């Protein structure tokens, strides 16, 4: 497995993916922050194959934070057995123990929608240990529910953590600046302008004129979105995932197809987005349809 194989279909620039690996290998924990529909989930499973350099699923683990995750679930907690409770090692604790089984081959833990949960509660002891410097046996620490006999848990050096925080919902944002230092934030853009998105459309029996038209109309909209900051900030800007999908059958792209997209998905999205004057909604829907 290699970069060329992965980046065949990805619409993200090569520039970021190398930037991602530059920060990740030095820092070992990163976050990909971008609006919904920019392939954050898509790349992250692919990155796992790059760093290990091989396609093995065991070295990868993927989870999502649902605002109901707790330290009892992630690392150490008490679970009922039949009549009486027992201590159950969580998923990450189970993973790190696998990770130190072989240090040579790198291990990835991928956490989608990291922004949601109260991360200070979930990681707890790990928030210190996750960081690149604070790894290995030197920084061994005893956990909360650890046995009376001293047993200490350290994040092994090989482990890499990747997080996927969407920037649309503002409330669900990391404001724990102590925590935001452990992670490195890589913005992911919508991906319209790039040819690698365009080539994907052209190959599926598409006119280059409509393709170039599509990106021109969208980028105008996102600037209107990006210009505001009170309600609709830079982060809300529309992703490219809508246009990607639904063309596998052989449906060629045309305004008839775009008309279904805009009326059905984007037009509801816009009216909720603005929700001050309908005229602004009528303007942008008609611009795309026009």
């Amino acid at each position: 497995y290699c970069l060329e194989d992965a980046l065949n279909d990805l619409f993200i620039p090569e520039t970021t993916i190398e930037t991602i690996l530059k920060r990740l290998t030095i820092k070992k924990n990163i976050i990909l922050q971008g609006p919904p529909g920019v392939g954050k989930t898509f790349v992250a499973r692919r990155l796992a194959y790059l760093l290990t350099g091989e396609k093995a699923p065991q070295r990868v683990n993927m989870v999502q934070f649902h605002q109901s995750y707790s330290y009892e679930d992630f690392i150490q907690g008490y679970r009922p057995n039949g009549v009486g409770f027992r201590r159950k090692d969580g998923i990450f604790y189970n993973f790190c123990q696998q990770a130190k089984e072989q240090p040579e081959k790198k291990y990835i833990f991928i956490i989608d929608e990291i922004n949601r949960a109260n991360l200070s509660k979930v990681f707890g002891e790990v928030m210190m240990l996750m960081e690149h410097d604070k790894r290995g046996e030197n920084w061994s620490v005893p956990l909360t529910y650890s046995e009376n006999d001293e047993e200490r848990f350290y994040v092994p050096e090989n482990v890499y953590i990747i997080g996927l925080m969407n920037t649309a919902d503002r409330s669900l944002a990391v404001v724990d600046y102590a925590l935001r230092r452990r992670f490195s934030f890589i913005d992911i853009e919508p991906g319209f302008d790039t040819p690698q998105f365009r080539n994907f459309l052209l190959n599926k029996k598409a006119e280059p004129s409509f393709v170039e038209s599509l990106c021109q109309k969208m980028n105008e909209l996102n600037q209107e979105i990006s210009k505001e900051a009170t309600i609709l900030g830079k982060g809300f800007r529309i992703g490219h995932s809508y246009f990607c999908c639904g063309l596998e059958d052989g449906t060629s792209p045309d305004t008839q197809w775009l008309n279904e997209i805009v009326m059905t998905d984007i037009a509801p999205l816009l009216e909720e987005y603005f929700f001050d004057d309908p005229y602004k909604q009528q303007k942008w829907t008609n611009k795309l349809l026009g």
């Binding site: 009892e72 008490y78 529910y145 503002r170 309600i231």
Partner: protein
């Protein structure tokens, strides 16, 4: 002691905040105007519905609700008396945004100088919100709400509530409040005016592009690259269009309201922005001085140091719609 009619001020605040019938209210003073907005504003919200934010609650109850926290359950031995520590998501209107409205309504109620009818409706509304908890307001509370999860409508009333809170002073009695004489002080009136134009320009001047532009001195210093000692210089507004760039500096002075000597100290700031600013496009460079006057508006033009500069005034107190014409009329002349 002449000042702007109070009703007109509210419109400048509205643009200042970036987002109605005032003919009905007979109380000329500002708090009468402002309270009627908030008092009616809350009522507009309730029709559609106030914000309900799911607040998680971890509490000790006699049964399973949502997710039981096993650790707190066994550690406190709550199972034995038929109780568990369980986490669940109560849906309340007690959000920080909503609490602020209610606490301000108390302030509006307590104000000694206020229309009686206005207080009557407000006291009803305070009663109409039983669940919400009263709060002791500070700016720090509003600071937390800059995230703007709330709707575009809520952010308006919160700005109103922010204004009242800051402009509240104790009066005759320890409990009651008295409104600040906002109009008299130049600094806050000017900061309104400077922000009023910047937000006004983005809305109306769709033709031109509007940005506040930071400027850097042409200087070099043998001592320091930093140049910290030099004054920090940031334009009030720059309104760039392909045909012409333009910087405006606007300020509110009491002396200028008098129809004698003239206060033009702000001009000293302006030239240096023109000089230090260098245009890549090289279409032209122009400046405008705009101040508020009461009776009438006069515009003059100047060619000072190779720059085209305007000294102009606007007759606030005339009428708000005509004022909108007058403000756009001015920018048309100079921008072109």
């Amino acid at each position: 002691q002449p000042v702007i009619p109070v009703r007109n001020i509210y419109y400048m605040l509205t643009y200042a905040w970036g987002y109605a019938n005032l003919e009905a209210i007979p109380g000329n003073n500002l708090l009468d105007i402002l309270g009627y907005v908030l008092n009616k504003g809350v009522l507009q919200l309730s029709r559609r519905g106030l914000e309900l934010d799911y607040n998680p609650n971890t509490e000790i109850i006699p049964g399973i609700k949502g997710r039981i926290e096993f650790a707190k359950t066994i550690r406190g031995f709550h199972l034995n008396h038929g109780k568990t520590v369980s986490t669940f998501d109560m849906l309340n209107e007690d959000t920080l945004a909503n609490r602020i409205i209610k606490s301000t309504l108390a302030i509006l109620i307590k104000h000694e100088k206020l229309n009686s009818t206005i207080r009557d409706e407000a006291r009803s509304l305070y009663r109409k919100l039983p669940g919400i908890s009263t709060l002791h307001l500070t700016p720090q509370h509003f600071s937390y709400l800059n995230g703007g999860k709330n709707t575009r409508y809520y952010k308006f009333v919160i700005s109103v509530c922010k204004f009242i809170v800051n402009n509240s002073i104790p009066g005759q009695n320890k409990g009651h409040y008295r409104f600040y004489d906002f109009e008299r002080n130049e600094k806050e009136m000017s900061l309104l005016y400077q922000k009023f134009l910047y937000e006004f320009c983005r809305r109306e001047l769709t033709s031109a592009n509007t940005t506040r532009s930071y400027l850097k001195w042409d200087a070099s210093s043998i001592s320091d690259q930093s140049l910290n000692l030099l004054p920090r210089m940031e334009t009030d507004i720059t309104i760039r269009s392909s045909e012409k760039i333009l910087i405006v500096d606007a300020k509110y002075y009491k002396s200028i309201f008098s129809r004698e000597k003239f206060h033009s100290q702000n001009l000293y700031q302006l030239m240096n922005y023109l000089w230090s600013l260098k245009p890549e496009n090289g279409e032209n460079i122009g400046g405008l001085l705009i101040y508020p006057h009461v009776d009438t508006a006069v515009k003059h033009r100047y060619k000072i140091n190779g720059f085209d500069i305007g000294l102009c005034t606007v007759n606030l107190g005339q009428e708000w719609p005509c004022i909108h014409q007058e403000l756009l009329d001015i920018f048309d002349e100079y921008l072109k």
